[PDB]
Design a protein around this ligand. Structure first.
Ligand SMILES: Cc1ccc(CC(=O)NC[C@@H]2CCCO2)cc1
Length: 284
């Protein structure tokens, strides 16, 4: 069923809450035993958000291999994403270790460091060229190279150096800065513009490791980003773009990380973004 029509039918009926709870009821339940070990309590931002054991990212060290991050692998779309929480004071070094080990080109950030008067994430990147960061726990150095500040997002060029081997790589930081403290944006225009800038960069392409995507918990805004990308890619690839079922794509992605899309408003926003993006890409 053409999603634009399904959309107006849910809107006129006002059944967004009922659709959203049907998804919550049908979603996969897999074990998260590593996340709940007592040695990992200070590696988790929220007690109710854990990566499944089968899909979790492992750090390459014998000590403790645990990070709150999951590999979302979309077989038909031929896209992979790592979804992770906003790093904590004790996990900044683990975060950059994962970026290095997985060969990611891009980091996508969908939150501000402070929102609603509370800290949503650590200040994990350098704000001035001449004041670099050193993560001694993981033996990495991070330097700000350049910064391009626009109305809805900022793009930063970073240099990450493995101090062990003296290898360096360029990492692009895509920071969406205007998601509101409450609710979702009114128009998906600036979010779609942002997604097309990440795509243009090569960060989402198969010649690199998976893009690292985060918000505060790594399931809400982060969920919206990968559901919209994968849905628009499937509409490009298939003979009938109207066969793409956004609820079925979301349940497939929820096999790999729990809780993706946190509210009925985020579900409605995801529909709006896909419906609108399907147009501009090929003038519909
Ligand atoms: C939350 C958090 C924790 C740790 C760090 C790393 C850091 O800034 N370390 C200090 C020296 C001064 C120059 C090189 O690094 C950043 C952010």
């Amino acid at each position: 069923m053409e999603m634009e029509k399904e959309f107006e039918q849910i809107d006129k009926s006002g059944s967004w809450a009922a659709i959203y709870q049907d998804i919550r009821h049908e979603a996969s339940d897999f074990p998260s035993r590593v996340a709940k070990l007592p040695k990992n309590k200070n590696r988790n931002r929220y007690r109710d958000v854990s990566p499944f054991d089968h899909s979790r990212i492992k750090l390459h060290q014998e000590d403790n291999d645990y990070i709150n991050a999951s590999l979302i692998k979309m077989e038909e779309a031929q896209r992979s994403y790592i979804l992770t929480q906003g790093p904590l004071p004790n996990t900044v070094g683990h975060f950059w270790e994962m970026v290095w080990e997985q060969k990611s080109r891009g980091v996508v950030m969908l939150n501000r460091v402070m929102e609603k008067g509370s800290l949503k994430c650590a200040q994990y990147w350098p704000q001035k060229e001449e004041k670099e960061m050193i993560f001694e726990d993981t033996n990495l150095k991070l330097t700000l190279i350049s910064e391009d500040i626009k109305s809805y997002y900022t793009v930063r060029q970073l240099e990450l150096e493995n101090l062990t081997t003296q290898e360096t790589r360029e990492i692009l930081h895509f920071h969406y800065t205007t998601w509101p403290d409450f609710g979702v944006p009114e128009s998906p225009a600036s979010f779609l513009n942002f997604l097309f800038k990440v795509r243009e960069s090569g960060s989402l392409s198969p010649e690199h490791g998976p893009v690292v995507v985060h918000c505060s918990a790594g399931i809400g805004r982060s969920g919206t980003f990968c559901l919209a990308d994968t849905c628009l890619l499937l509409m490009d690839k298939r003979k009938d773009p109207s066969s793409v079922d956004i609820k079925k794509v979301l349940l497939e992605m929820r096999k790999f990380r729990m809780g993706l899309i946190q509210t009925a408003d985020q579900l409605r926003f995801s529909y709006l973004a896909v419906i609108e993006g399907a147009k501009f890409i090929m003038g519909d």
